[PDB]
Amino acid sequence: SNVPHKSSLPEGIRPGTVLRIAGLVPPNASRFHVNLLCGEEQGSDAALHFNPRLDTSEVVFNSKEQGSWGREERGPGVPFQRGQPFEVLIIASDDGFKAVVGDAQYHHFRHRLPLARVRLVEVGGDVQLDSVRIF
Amino acid sequence: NVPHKSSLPEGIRPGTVLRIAGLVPPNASRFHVNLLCGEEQGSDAALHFNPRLDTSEVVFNSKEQGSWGREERGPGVPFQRGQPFEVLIIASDDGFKAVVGDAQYHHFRHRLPLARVRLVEVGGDVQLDSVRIF
Secondary structure, eight states, X not given: OOOSEEXXXXXXXXXXEEEEEEEEOOTTOOBEEEEEESSSSTTOOEEXXXXXXXXXXXXXXXXXXXXXXXXXXXXXXXXXXXXXXXXEEEEEOSSEEEEEETTEEEEEEEOSSOGGXXXXXXXXXXXXXXXXXXX | OOOEEEEOTXXXXXXXXXXXXXXXXXXXXXXXXXXXXXXXXXXXXXXXXXXXXXXXXXXXXXXETTEEOOOEEOSSOSOOTTXXXXXXXXXXXXXXXXXXXXXXXXXXXXXXXXXXXXEEEEEESOEEEEEEEO
8 A cells, every 4th residue: 555655855846846646545544645744754844735534525735834734725625535546746836736636726735835845755644555756 | 630739828837737648640650749939830949849650769859930959859769659648748947847658758958938938739640638737
């Protein structure tokens, strides 16, 4: 199932970076996450926390800075389903992160931390990961 | 087979993603994807992505004022006759990242300004499934 899955980004990511995450949402999944982290330590700051919640039918976006979570943003409905595969694109621009789900633009999350702080991508939770690619 | 045209109303910026899904015909010679700066014939091409299956090469190039540039070539041909493909053209601040399949294939540094791009054009021997701008 390959979780928790970590992808190190020693030189960071620039505007024009695409994170492609594919996987299956297992039959009794509660929630999973894709984190863009500043370091490898526990509780590391997070430029992006992408959190589909199957049990509450929401998709939460947040950030973590100086150990404190920001204010949650929510996307429109849950474009994931228990027992169904998915494809997510997280696209970094100069202005924020574009979340694409199932070939449809889903939500835009404005930068709160500098994009230059990102050093790691972490995928975890109730997800059976197909692949994580970083272009 | 008139080329497919898709206008870019707000141009493209670092973070624009062009997903081109399609199928190569069994008798295909070559097809191309152009990022053009105007809707006139002979407009500047900020990016000319040209896979060539008749000679087994993939050529990158630019064009301004009707004059081309120096060709760049990628490793082999990640395209086969009769086989489908998915291409990502990702604009960064440094250039265009071309992705074929699940791997970055080439990095074409910006020869022309990114803000001058206004039209995507797909032509040649190719069956076009979908053109998406993200």
